[PDB]
Design a protein around this nucleic acid. Structure first.
Ligand SMILES: Nc1ccn([C@H]2C[C@H](O)[C@@H](COP(=O)(O)OP(=O)(O)OP(=O)(O)O)O2)c(=O)n1
Ligand SMILES: [Ca+2]
Ligand SMILES: [K+]
Length: 430
DNA sequence: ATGATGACGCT
DNA sequence: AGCGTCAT
């Protein structure tokens, strides 16, 4: 009752760019706008692997991981943009720079946690308090929320999608207690107003559209963001959680999409996130461990405490290349040449990073994969990163991997290498 | 033969 | 430290 925390103390938003890499290419090439189109890498193998898909192309069934030759059978007029290739490998610089454009806009409104190249969490609790003091009990107009969905509404006693959206919004705003500055529903609503303003600023200053979720924590904000895409935002209130979770497959919740969520399903014999409420904390901790059990117990009630971390920059800068099947590297010279290619791209990104962000990496992680392993990485070893020099980093990487070579012959590499990865880590201010 | 990333938990 | 999970 009066002491049972409800997880309603924060306003958290997740902003996610719609078909991000596609929008980057469509901004650059107007011929691609408003068309079925996809972003591919490496044109030689089956037209390239698709890594991003516009919503027009999704209507034909085009998905990520499709080969472009196969996608073209689903969508013969599919337009494609290729990822840049430099030093024999895909180069994602254009998308990292576009990401920076968005992240810097988002940071004008609140401190962000960069979750990915195209997603950031925002803690809006303080901005909402300030905006509420500026409103002075004044009601919130539906015109301030022109692209907001209220999850779970409309409800109770028009057949077009926007009509539904407005009906639900009207019901929400009619119900709102705007005199209570500490109503969590009011705080979420003001949050949504700010997120409308943030999304409009992103679109105005970059051309990119995004979606967003507004709730009381990161998991609900992420789930909310995906409920109405593209170019929309969804408010998921605490009160909407029981109905929303009652038919929500467990794998949809962030961190349950893999083996842990599969084990929750198998071990407990359930399907939906709401079904977790019937277990005690101790039961869940017995099955999934102390941290996971506590987290599931709170999460299935809509409660989560993972804070929005103040981090706008990536913590690592990595360069990786696969060498599949027949192309696996079998000669020592092949391994040195590719390590140098990776090291040169890494040097260039690190130098840029040190000029922009006043920091230097201090550790070099080298990871390889050998032909035969099912694991994505077969061996990871670190050394000191003391100079931003590609020839030195590639030499050191080779030094810490060269004893993996099973071969008796010096010039050969066995087993051949199917993946090389160089990662700069452990940044220090400078 | 998806591939190229990136964060964080466990021991 | 090195390995694994989960994600974009
Ligand atoms: N397995 C993946 C997932 C994503 N990406 C890249 C390309 C995507 O454009 C971008 C963002 O990924 P999302 O999962 O957010 O997907 P999109 O932004 O493409 O689409 P959506 O509108 O569904 O978010 O990251 C990638 O290279 N490989
Ligand atoms: Ca996205
Ligand atoms: K994303």
């Amino acid at each position: 009752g009066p002491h049972m925390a409800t997880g309603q103390d924060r306003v958290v938003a997740l902003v996610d760019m719609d078909c991000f890499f596609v929008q980057v290419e469509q901004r650059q090439n107007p011929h691609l706008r408003n068309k079925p189109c996809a972003v591919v890498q490496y044109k030689s193998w089956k037209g390239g692997g698709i890594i991003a898909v516009s919503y027009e192309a999704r209507a034909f069934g085009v998905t990520r991981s499709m080969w472009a030759d196969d996608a073209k059978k689903l969508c013969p007029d599919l337009l494609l943009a290729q990822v840049r290739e430099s030093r024999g490998k895909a180069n994602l610089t254009k998308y990292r720079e576009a990401s920076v454009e968005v992240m810097e806009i988002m940071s004008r409104f609140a401190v962000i946690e960069r979750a990915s190249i195209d997603e950031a969490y925002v803690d809006l609790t303080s901005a909402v308090q300030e905006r509420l003091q500026k409103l002075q009990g004044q009601p919130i107009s539906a015109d301030l929320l022109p692209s907001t969905y209220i999850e779970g509404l409309p409800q109770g006693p028009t057949v077009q999608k926007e009509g539904m959206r407005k009906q639900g919004l009207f019901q929400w705003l009619d119900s709102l207690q705007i005199d209570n500055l500490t109503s969590p529903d009011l705080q979420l609503t003001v949050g949504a107003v700010i997120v409308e303003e943030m999304r409009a600023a992103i679109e105005r200053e970059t051309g990119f559209q995004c979606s967003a979720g507004i709730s009381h924590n990161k998991v609900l904000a992420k789930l909310a963001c995906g409920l109405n895409k593209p170019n929309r935002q969804t408010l998921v209130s605490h009160g909407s959680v029981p109905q929303l979770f009652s038919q929500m497959p467990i794998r949809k919740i962030r961190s349950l999409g893999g083996k842990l969520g599969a084990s929750v399903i198998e071990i407990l014999g359930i399907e939906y996130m709401g079904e977790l409420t019937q277990f005690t904390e101790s039961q869940l901790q017995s099955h999934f461990g102390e941290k996971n059990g506590s987290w599931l117990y709170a999460m299935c009630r809509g409660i989560e405490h993972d804070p929005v971390k103040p981090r706008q920059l990536p913590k690592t800068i990595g360069c990786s290349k696969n060498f599949p099947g027949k192309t696996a590297l079998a000669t020592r010279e092949q391994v040195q040449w590719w390590l140098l290619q990776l090291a040169q791209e890494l040097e260039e990104r690190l130098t840029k990073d040190r000029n922009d962000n006043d920091r230097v990496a201090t550790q070099l992680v080298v990871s390889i994969r050998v032909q035969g392993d099912k694991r994505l990485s077969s061996l990871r070893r670190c050394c000191a990163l003391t100079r931003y020099d590609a020839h030195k980093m590639s030499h050191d990487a080779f030094t810490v991997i060269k004893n993996c070579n099973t071969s008796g012959i010096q010039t050969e590499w066995s087993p051949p290498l199917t993946m090389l990865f160089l990662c700069a880590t452990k940044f220090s201010a400078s």
